[PDB]
Amino acid sequence: DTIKIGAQSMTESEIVANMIAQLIEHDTDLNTALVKNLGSNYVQHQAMLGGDIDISATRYSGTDLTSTLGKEAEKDPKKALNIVQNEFQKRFSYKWFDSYGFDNTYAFTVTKKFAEKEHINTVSDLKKNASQYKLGVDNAWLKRKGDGYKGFVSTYGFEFGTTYPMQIGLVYDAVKNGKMDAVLAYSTDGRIKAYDLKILKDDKRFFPPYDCSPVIPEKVLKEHPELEGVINKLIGQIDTETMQELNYEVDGKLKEPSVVAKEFLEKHHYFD
Numbered sequence: 001d002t003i004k005i006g007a008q009s010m011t012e013s014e015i016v017a018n019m020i021a022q023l024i025e026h027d028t029d030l031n032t033a034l035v036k037n038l039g040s041n042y043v044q045h046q047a048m049l050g051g052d053i054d055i056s057a058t059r060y061s062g063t064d065l066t067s068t069l070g071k072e073a074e075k076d077p078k079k080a081l082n083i084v085q086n087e088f089q090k091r092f093s094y095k096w097f098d099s100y101g102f103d104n105t106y107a108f109t110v111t112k113k114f115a116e117k118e119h120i121n122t123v124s125d126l127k128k129n130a131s132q133y134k135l136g137v138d139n140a141w142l143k144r145k146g147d148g149y150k151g152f153v154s155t156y157g158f159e160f161g162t163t164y165p166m167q168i169g170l171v172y173d174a175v176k177n178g179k180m181d182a183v184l185a186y187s188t189d190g191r192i193k194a195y196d197l198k199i200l201k202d203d204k205r206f207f208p209p210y211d212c213s214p215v216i217p218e219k220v221l222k223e224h225p226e227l228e229g230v231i232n233k234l235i236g237q238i239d240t241e242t243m244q245e246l247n248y249e250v251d252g253k254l255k256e257p258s259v260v261a262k263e264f265l266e267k268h269h270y271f272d
Protein backbone atom coordinates (compact mmCIF):
# COMPACT_ATOMS: atom_id res chain seq x y z
CA ASP A 1 0.00 0.00 0.00
CA THR A 2 2.06 2.88 -1.44
CA ILE A 3 0.40 6.20 -2.28
CA LYS A 4 1.43 7.53 -5.68
CA ILE A 5 1.66 11.37 -5.76
CA GLY A 6 1.81 13.06 -9.16
CA ALA A 7 4.09 15.99 -9.76
CA GLN A 8 3.77 18.27 -12.74
CA SER A 9 6.97 19.58 -14.24
CA MET A 10 6.82 22.77 -12.20
CA THR A 11 8.97 23.71 -9.24
CA GLU A 12 5.72 24.41 -7.38
CA SER A 13 4.16 21.03 -8.21
CA GLU A 14 7.35 19.25 -7.06
CA ILE A 15 7.64 21.14 -3.73
CA VAL A 16 3.98 20.50 -2.91
CA ALA A 17 4.19 16.81 -3.96
CA ASN A 18 7.04 16.27 -1.51
CA MET A 19 5.19 18.22 1.16
CA ILE A 20 2.23 15.86 0.77
CA ALA A 21 4.50 12.77 0.65
CA GLN A 22 6.32 13.69 3.84
CA LEU A 23 3.22 14.65 5.78
CA ILE A 24 1.61 11.32 4.91
CA GLU A 25 4.60 9.27 6.15
CA HIS A 26 4.96 11.41 9.28
CA ASP A 27 1.27 11.01 10.24
CA THR A 28 0.71 7.52 8.81
CA ASP A 29 2.18 4.09 8.09
CA LEU A 30 1.29 4.71 4.48
CA ASN A 31 4.41 5.19 2.35
CA THR A 32 4.70 7.29 -0.76
CA ALA A 33 6.13 7.52 -4.27
CA LEU A 34 6.33 10.62 -6.47
CA VAL A 35 5.39 10.40 -10.14
CA LYS A 36 7.34 13.33 -11.57
CA ASN A 37 7.35 15.21 -14.88
CA LEU A 38 3.75 15.13 -16.01
CA GLY A 39 3.63 17.76 -18.73
CA SER A 40 0.24 19.33 -17.97
CA ASN A 41 -3.12 19.08 -16.19
CA TYR A 42 -4.28 16.83 -19.04
CA VAL A 43 -1.37 14.47 -18.40
CA GLN A 44 -2.18 14.61 -14.66
CA HIS A 45 -5.87 13.86 -15.14
CA GLN A 46 -5.17 11.08 -17.69
CA ALA A 47 -2.76 9.52 -15.22
CA MET A 48 -5.46 9.56 -12.48
CA LEU A 49 -8.08 8.00 -14.76
CA GLY A 50 -5.74 5.06 -15.44
CA GLY A 51 -4.72 4.48 -11.82
CA ASP A 52 -1.17 5.75 -12.43
CA ILE A 53 -1.50 8.34 -9.64
CA ASP A 54 -3.60 8.44 -6.47
CA ILE A 55 -3.09 12.18 -5.65
CA SER A 56 -2.64 15.28 -7.78
CA ALA A 57 -0.54 17.73 -5.72
CA THR A 58 -1.27 20.79 -7.85
CA ARG A 59 -4.41 21.39 -9.88
CA TYR A 60 -5.69 24.89 -10.82
CA SER A 61 -9.35 25.77 -11.06
CA GLY A 62 -9.29 27.79 -14.32
CA THR A 63 -7.08 25.26 -16.11
CA ASP A 64 -9.23 22.19 -15.54
CA LEU A 65 -12.47 24.12 -15.96
CA THR A 66 -11.60 25.05 -19.50
CA SER A 67 -9.88 21.95 -20.67
CA THR A 68 -10.80 18.85 -18.74
CA LEU A 69 -14.45 19.88 -18.16
CA GLY A 70 -14.83 21.74 -21.47
CA LYS A 71 -16.57 24.66 -19.80
CA GLU A 72 -16.48 28.43 -20.40
CA ALA A 73 -13.83 30.40 -18.49
CA GLU A 74 -15.75 31.40 -15.38
CA LYS A 75 -14.22 34.68 -14.20
CA ASP A 76 -15.24 34.52 -10.48
CA PRO A 77 -12.89 32.67 -8.06
CA LYS A 78 -15.68 31.30 -5.83
CA LYS A 79 -18.02 30.28 -8.70
CA ALA A 80 -15.15 28.69 -10.68
CA LEU A 81 -14.14 26.55 -7.70
CA ASN A 82 -17.70 25.35 -7.08
CA ILE A 83 -18.30 24.29 -10.66
CA VAL A 84 -14.96 22.44 -10.63
CA GLN A 85 -15.71 20.77 -7.31
CA ASN A 86 -19.23 19.77 -8.28
CA GLU A 87 -18.11 18.56 -11.72
CA PHE A 88 -15.32 16.35 -10.43
CA GLN A 89 -17.50 14.85 -7.77
CA LYS A 90 -20.42 14.40 -10.23
CA ARG A 91 -18.29 13.19 -13.21
CA PHE A 92 -15.44 11.06 -11.85
CA SER A 93 -16.18 10.82 -8.10
CA TYR A 94 -12.95 12.74 -7.64
CA LYS A 95 -12.65 15.19 -4.76
CA TRP A 96 -11.31 18.59 -5.78
CA PHE A 97 -10.26 19.91 -2.37
CA ASP A 98 -10.47 23.52 -1.22
CA SER A 99 -7.35 25.49 -2.17
CA TYR A 100 -4.06 25.68 -0.29
CA GLY A 101 -4.81 29.39 -0.16
CA PHE A 102 -3.10 30.54 -3.34
CA ASP A 103 -3.86 31.41 -6.96
CA ASN A 104 -1.22 30.75 -9.61
CA THR A 105 -2.39 32.77 -12.64
CA TYR A 106 -0.91 33.62 -16.02
CA ALA A 107 0.48 37.12 -15.79
CA PHE A 108 1.90 39.33 -18.53
CA THR A 109 5.32 40.25 -17.18
CA VAL A 110 7.70 42.97 -18.37
CA THR A 111 10.88 44.62 -17.10
CA LYS A 112 10.37 47.99 -15.40
CA LYS A 113 12.72 49.68 -17.90
CA PHE A 114 10.43 48.45 -20.69
CA ALA A 115 7.25 49.68 -19.02
CA GLU A 116 8.83 53.13 -18.29
CA LYS A 117 10.19 53.31 -21.86
CA GLU A 118 6.89 52.17 -23.47
CA HIS A 119 4.44 53.75 -20.99
CA ILE A 120 2.94 50.41 -19.93
CA ASN A 121 0.54 49.52 -17.14
CA THR A 122 -1.92 47.17 -18.56
CA VAL A 123 -2.22 44.40 -20.98
CA SER A 124 -4.14 46.74 -23.30
CA ASP A 125 -1.19 49.20 -23.30
CA LEU A 126 0.67 46.51 -25.29
CA LYS A 127 -1.72 46.84 -28.24
CA LYS A 128 -0.13 50.07 -29.50
CA ASN A 129 3.13 48.49 -30.64
CA ALA A 130 2.24 44.84 -30.12
CA SER A 131 3.51 43.71 -33.54
CA GLN A 132 6.92 45.10 -32.56
CA TYR A 133 7.11 42.75 -29.59
CA LYS A 134 8.51 39.30 -28.86
CA LEU A 135 6.35 37.33 -26.35
CA GLY A 136 7.73 34.45 -24.26
CA VAL A 137 5.13 31.76 -23.44
CA ASP A 138 5.05 28.16 -22.17
CA ASN A 139 4.98 25.07 -24.39
CA ALA A 140 1.13 24.66 -24.22
CA TRP A 141 -0.61 28.07 -23.82
CA LEU A 142 -0.73 28.84 -27.59
CA LYS A 143 -2.76 25.65 -28.20
CA ARG A 144 -5.19 26.09 -25.30
CA LYS A 145 -8.95 26.52 -25.78
CA GLY A 146 -10.80 29.01 -23.56
CA ASP A 147 -7.83 30.49 -21.68
CA GLY A 148 -5.24 30.26 -24.48
CA TYR A 149 -3.92 32.54 -27.25
CA LYS A 150 -6.98 32.31 -29.52
CA GLY A 151 -9.12 33.57 -26.58
CA PHE A 152 -6.66 36.36 -25.77
CA VAL A 153 -6.68 37.57 -29.41
CA SER A 154 -10.50 37.72 -29.58
CA THR A 155 -10.59 39.40 -26.14
CA TYR A 156 -7.83 42.04 -26.21
CA GLY A 157 -8.25 42.45 -29.99
CA PHE A 158 -4.54 42.21 -30.86
CA GLU A 159 -1.67 39.77 -31.41
CA PHE A 160 2.09 39.94 -30.75
CA GLY A 161 4.88 40.42 -33.30
CA THR A 162 6.29 36.99 -32.62
CA THR A 163 5.49 34.43 -29.94
CA TYR A 164 8.10 32.01 -28.66
CA PRO A 165 7.09 28.86 -26.80
CA MET A 166 9.63 27.65 -24.24
CA GLN A 167 9.75 25.82 -20.89
CA ILE A 168 8.02 27.99 -18.26
CA GLY A 169 11.17 27.90 -16.07
CA LEU A 170 13.17 29.92 -18.63
CA VAL A 171 10.92 32.98 -19.23
CA TYR A 172 12.17 34.67 -16.03
CA ASP A 173 15.68 35.14 -17.40
CA ALA A 174 14.67 35.72 -21.05
CA VAL A 175 12.53 38.72 -20.09
CA LYS A 176 15.24 39.94 -17.66
CA ASN A 177 18.06 39.69 -20.14
CA GLY A 178 16.17 41.48 -22.90
CA LYS A 179 15.69 38.40 -25.04
CA MET A 180 11.91 39.03 -24.77
CA ASP A 181 9.96 42.25 -24.42
CA ALA A 182 7.29 40.46 -22.41
CA VAL A 183 6.56 36.95 -21.07
CA LEU A 184 3.47 35.14 -19.85
CA ALA A 185 4.89 34.27 -16.41
CA TYR A 186 3.26 32.30 -13.57
CA SER A 187 2.30 34.64 -10.72
CA THR A 188 3.67 32.41 -7.88
CA ASP A 189 7.18 32.20 -9.35
CA GLY A 190 9.43 33.94 -6.84
CA ARG A 191 11.76 35.29 -9.54
CA ILE A 192 9.22 38.02 -10.46
CA LYS A 193 9.81 39.89 -7.17
CA ALA A 194 13.44 38.75 -7.20
CA TYR A 195 14.04 40.39 -10.59
CA ASP A 196 11.95 43.47 -9.73
CA LEU A 197 9.71 42.61 -12.70
CA LYS A 198 6.34 44.21 -13.39
CA ILE A 199 3.09 42.26 -13.55
CA LEU A 200 0.69 43.91 -15.97
CA LYS A 201 -2.99 44.27 -15.17
CA ASP A 202 -5.46 41.95 -16.89
CA ASP A 203 -7.69 44.87 -17.44
CA LYS A 204 -10.19 42.95 -19.51
CA ARG A 205 -10.26 40.00 -17.05
CA PHE A 206 -9.58 37.54 -19.84
CA PHE A 207 -7.99 34.90 -17.63
CA PRO A 208 -10.13 32.74 -15.34
CA PRO A 209 -8.97 32.35 -11.73
CA TYR A 210 -6.38 29.73 -11.00
CA ASP A 211 -6.79 28.67 -7.39
CA CYS A 212 -4.52 25.74 -6.54
CA SER A 213 -5.83 22.54 -4.96
CA PRO A 214 -5.07 18.83 -4.46
CA VAL A 215 -7.30 16.19 -6.14
CA ILE A 216 -7.88 12.61 -4.98
CA PRO A 217 -10.44 9.98 -5.95
CA GLU A 218 -12.99 9.22 -3.24
CA LYS A 219 -12.08 5.63 -4.11
CA VAL A 220 -8.71 6.37 -2.48
CA LEU A 221 -10.10 8.33 0.46
CA LYS A 222 -12.47 5.41 1.20
CA GLU A 223 -9.55 2.99 1.28
CA HIS A 224 -7.33 5.17 3.34
CA PRO A 225 -9.62 6.95 5.77
CA GLU A 226 -6.73 8.58 7.61
CA LEU A 227 -5.56 10.31 4.42
CA GLU A 228 -8.08 13.14 4.17
CA GLY A 229 -7.14 14.40 7.64
CA VAL A 230 -3.55 14.75 6.44
CA ILE A 231 -4.37 16.76 3.27
CA ASN A 232 -6.70 18.92 5.38
CA LYS A 233 -3.69 20.12 7.41
CA LEU A 234 -2.52 21.97 4.28
CA ILE A 235 -5.87 23.49 3.26
CA GLY A 236 -5.80 27.30 3.47
CA GLN A 237 -2.23 27.15 4.84
CA ILE A 238 -0.12 28.45 1.92
CA ASP A 239 -0.82 31.95 0.56
CA THR A 240 0.61 33.29 -2.73
CA GLU A 241 3.38 35.09 -0.80
CA THR A 242 4.43 31.87 1.01
CA MET A 243 4.33 29.90 -2.27
CA GLN A 244 6.55 32.58 -3.91
CA GLU A 245 9.28 32.13 -1.28
CA LEU A 246 9.08 28.33 -1.41
CA ASN A 247 9.30 28.38 -5.21
CA TYR A 248 12.32 30.73 -5.01
CA GLU A 249 14.11 28.39 -2.53
CA VAL A 250 14.30 25.91 -5.41
CA ASP A 251 14.55 28.37 -8.29
CA GLY A 252 16.82 31.10 -6.92
CA LYS A 253 18.85 29.22 -4.28
CA LEU A 254 18.82 25.83 -6.12
CA LYS A 255 17.59 23.58 -3.26
CA GLU A 256 15.90 20.22 -3.74
CA PRO A 257 12.06 20.43 -3.57
CA SER A 258 12.23 17.81 -0.76
CA VAL A 259 14.57 19.97 1.36
CA VAL A 260 12.28 23.02 0.88
CA ALA A 261 9.14 21.05 1.78
CA LYS A 262 10.85 19.52 4.87
CA GLU A 263 12.04 22.94 6.04
CA PHE A 264 8.53 24.35 5.55
CA LEU A 265 6.97 21.38 7.38
CA GLU A 266 9.55 21.65 10.19
CA LYS A 267 8.84 25.38 10.63
CA HIS A 268 5.11 24.77 11.20
CA HIS A 269 5.63 21.58 13.31
CA TYR A 270 4.08 19.45 10.62
CA PHE A 271 0.88 21.19 11.75
CA ASP A 272 0.71 18.68 14.67
Ligand SMILES: C[N+](C)(C)C[C@@H](O)CC(=O)O
Nearest residue numbers: 040041060104105106210
Ligand atom coordinates in the same frame (compact mmCIF):
# COMPACT_ATOMS: atom_id res chain seq x y z
C1 LIG B 1 -0.18 27.27 -13.76
N1 LIG B 1 -1.36 27.56 -14.55
C2 LIG B 1 -2.48 27.64 -13.63
C3 LIG B 1 -1.33 28.89 -15.12
C4 LIG B 1 -1.56 26.66 -15.67
C5 LIG B 1 -0.97 25.28 -15.81
O1 LIG B 1 -0.74 24.51 -14.81
C6 LIG B 1 -1.34 24.54 -17.08
C7 LIG B 1 -1.42 23.05 -16.90
O2 LIG B 1 -1.49 22.51 -15.86
O3 LIG B 1 -1.14 22.46 -18.04
